[PDB]
Paper text:
For rotaviruses (RVs), which are the major causative agents of life-threatening gastroenteritis in children under the age of 5 years and result in 453,000 deaths worldwide annually, recognition of specific cellular glycans for initial cell attachment is mediated by the distally located VP8* domain of the spike protein VP4. Although structurally conserved with a galectin-like fold, sequence-wise VP8* is the least conserved among RV structural proteins contributing to a phylogeny consisting of 37 [P] genotypes9. Our crystallographic analyses provide the structural basis to explain the unique glycan specificity exhibited by a neonate-specific bovine-human reassortant RV strain and its parental bovine strain, each belonging to the P genotype. We have shown that P VP8* exhibits a novel glycan-binding site that adapts to a differential recognition of precursor glycans, which are the core elements of HBGA and human/bovine milk glycans.
The residues interacting with the type II glycan in the P HRV VP8* are conserved in the BRV VP8*, indicating that the bovine VP8* can also bind glycans with the β1,4 motif using the same binding site. To test our hypothesis that both human and bovine P VP8*s use the same binding site to interact with type II glycan, we co-crystallized bovine P VP8* with LNnT. The crystals, with four molecules in the asymmetric unit, diffracted to 1.46 Å. The crystal structure shows that the Galβ1,4-GlcNAc moieties of LNnT at the non-reducing end interact at the same binding site as in the human P VP8* with similar hydrophobic interactions involving the conserved N155, Y156, W178, G179 and D185 and hydrogen bond interactions involving the conserved R154 and R187. The electron density for the Glc moiety at the reducing end, however, is not well defined in any of the four molecules in the asymmetric unit because of the lack of engagement by the protein and was not modelled in the final structure. Similar to P HRV VP8*, bovine VP8* also undergoes conformational changes upon binding to LNnT including reorientation of the side chains of R154 and R187. In the ligand-bound bovine P VP8* structure, in all the four molecules of the asymmetric unit, the conformation of the J-K loop remains the same as in the apo structure, despite the space group difference, indicating that the different conformation of the J-K loop from that observed in the human P VP8* is mainly due to the sequence variations and not the ligand binding or crystal contacts. Consistent with the structural observation, co-crystallization of P BRV B223 VP8* with LNT using similar concentrations as the LNnT did not show any density for the bound LNT, indicating that LNT cannot bind to B223 VP8*.
Residue numbers in the entry: 64 to 225
The structure:
Amino acid sequence: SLDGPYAPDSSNLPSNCWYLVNPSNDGVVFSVTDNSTFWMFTYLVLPNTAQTNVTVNVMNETVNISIDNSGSTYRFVDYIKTSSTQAYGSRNYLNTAHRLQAYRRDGDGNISNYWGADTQGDLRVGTYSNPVPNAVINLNADFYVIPDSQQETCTEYIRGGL
Ligand SMILES: CC(=O)N[C@H]1[C@H](O[C@H]2[C@@H](O)[C@@H](CO)O[C@@H](O[C@H]3[C@H](O)[C@@H](O)[C@H](O)O[C@@H]3CO)[C@@H]2O)O[C@H](CO)[C@@H](O[C@@H]2O[C@H](CO)[C@H](O)[C@H](O)[C@H]2O)[C@@H]1O
C-alpha cells in the first residue's frame, strides 16, 4: 500500500508524485541541478547544533555552508544558488521531530517540498520558482513514492511519521 522503501537513487524522476525521504543520518538528503540555472540541496541538521561551518560534497562540487539548529527538533534546510560562481544560501526549511521530508517536481519542472517552523499550524507545501524539468534528482535516503492524488496522506506522514 505504501510504495517503498526504495534505496537511495539518482534519476530524472517523473513529475507530480511525491518522493518521501526517510534518512537515518544527517547531512545532504536531496539534491538537484540543471548545471545552468538552479542548484538545490537539503541538509538535515541534528537538534541542538551550534552554528558551524561544514564542508559538503554535492553535485560534483565541494562547498562550505553555515548550519545551525539550536532547537530541539530536526531541521531539513534547503540551500540554493542560481549561478555556478555564486555561494549557496539557505532558503526554506522544515523543523520536525521526524526524519521525513518530501519532494515533488511539477509539470513545469519546479521543485516543491514541505516548509515550516513546525509541522502543525506553520506547515505548508512550498514551491521554488526555478524550473529544472529534465534534471537528475538525487534522493540520498530510503524513500517512498506517493501519487499527487494522495498528497494529504503524504502530509500526514510529514506530521506524524510513517
Ligand atoms: C515562496 C517562498 O520561498 N517563501 C519564503 C519567503 O521567500 C521570499 C524571500 O526569500 C524574499 C527575500 O527578500 O524574496 C522573495 O522572492 C521575491 C524575489 O526576491 C523578488 O526579486 C521577486 O521580484 O519577487 C519574489 C516574490 O517571491 C521570496 O518569495 O521567505 C520567507 C522568509 O523571509 C519564508 O518564510 C519562512 O519560512 C520558514 C520555513 O521555510 C518558516 O515558516 C518561517 O517562519 C518563515 O518566516 C517563505 O517560506
